[PDB]
Structures are given as structure tokens and as C-alpha cells.
């Protein structure tokens, strides 16, 4: 299996200011075209899952533009620039690709007040 | 978009007992071959989802065979025959191959004392 490592595990931080989070796949995602296979998912608090990134850098629509995905081979990012309330959520990157299909362990992002 | 419409939202049972949970899309999610793409995640307390089945009925490795998945087209099912203490969880089906892939709202499964 790929194993996917999430990093930080969780961080607290003000509205309107930058994040980064980290994800790191023990198999490298990047294929012939240039195509990294990697997504990147929220889960908001009692939610399911909803699929924010996908081939690492793209946006699914509707999904805002302080959301940034990147990276290539094995280490992904994915920032936000500037952190709203409604980002209040858990965030996975995954192996979309290669079965059986991995999910990290998730960045828990909490809003300071 | 497809919705997936999972039911119930939440059950208790006690262990050794079976259960059945539904999911319905609003898309026919059945091919050509014969082949729904239709995932099954489980995803315990504090944890990132994990497959269990894919294709509908296709388990996992590792995966117990008192997961059973069936069904075709629109109409899903989910049955664990025996409900074991670890196999406490959210359940979610999925829509795993038209873009942009959707979850259902979950089967919050809850053992009884």
C-alpha cells in the first residue's frame, strides 16, 4: 500500500492568515504525462468528505482560490492564504489512483478566536 | 453533481447481530461490463476514511466476509451479518468515477451495552 503522511497533525490559527500543510506519499503519485495522482479532500464537522483538489493543483468548481494545491512525485502542499471560518474542517490528502486507494491521517485546521 | 442518499443516518445494534444500510444515487452508476463504480469507506473514530469495497461487492484485502456489498444501477446495500465491537464507525458509499466524486451523508453505526 501507499502510505500517505499528513503533516501537522492539527494547528490553531486567526481569520484571514496563511496555512500550509504537508503531505507525503511513501510511492511516488507523478505518471508519464506529467499528471500527479493526488487528491485532496475536506471534511467539515459531521460531514462527509468532499473532494476539494484533484491531480494535485486542480480545483474542483466552486472551490475558492485561497486554496492552492501543489507539489510533484511524492511531496504535496496544499496552502490556504488566507483562512476564513467556513475552512473550519479536517483536510486529507489521497492516493486516488493506486489500489487499494490511501487516505493520510488528516490536518485538523481550528480557528482561534 | 451525483447525490448519494444514505440510510439510515445512524443505528445501534449488539454485537453478533446483522445490519443493513442503504445507499441510492441519483445516477446510474452501472457500465458497459457489468460494473457499478460504487465505492464502500469505513471510518473509525478519530480516523481518515478506509475502502472496504469497491465494484459494489468487491472487498478489500483484508477486509472480513461479514461485509457483503450489493446491488446494481441506482440501488446499493451494505450488510455486516455479525457486528463485531471494532467495527464501530461511519460508513459512507461513494460515487468513484464521475467527476466530481461524491459521498453520501453516512451510516453512523453504534454498538449497544
Known amino acids: 500500500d501507499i502510505v500517505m503522511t499528513q503533516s501537522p497533525s492539527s494547528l490553531s490559527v486567526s481569520a484571514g492568515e496563511r496555512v500550509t500543510m504537508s503531505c507525503k506519499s511513501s510511492q511516488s503519485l507523478l505518471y508519464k504525462d506529467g499528471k500527479n495522482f493526488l487528491a485532496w479532500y475536506q471534511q467539515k464537522p459531521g460531514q462527509p468528505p468532499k473532494l476539494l483538489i484533484y491531480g494535485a493543483s486542480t480545483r474542483e468548481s466552486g472551490v475558492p482560490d485561497r486554496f492552492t494545491g501543489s507539489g510533484s512525485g511524492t511531496d504535496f502542499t496544499l496552502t ?15 492516493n486516488d489512483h493506486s489500489y487499494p486507494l490511501t487516505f493520510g491521517a488528516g490536518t485538523k485546521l481550528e480557528l482561534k478566536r
Chains 1, 2 share one sequence.
Open 80 to 94: 490556504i492564504s488566507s483562512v476564513q471560518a467556513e475552512d473550519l474542517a479536517v483536510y486529507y490528502c489521497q
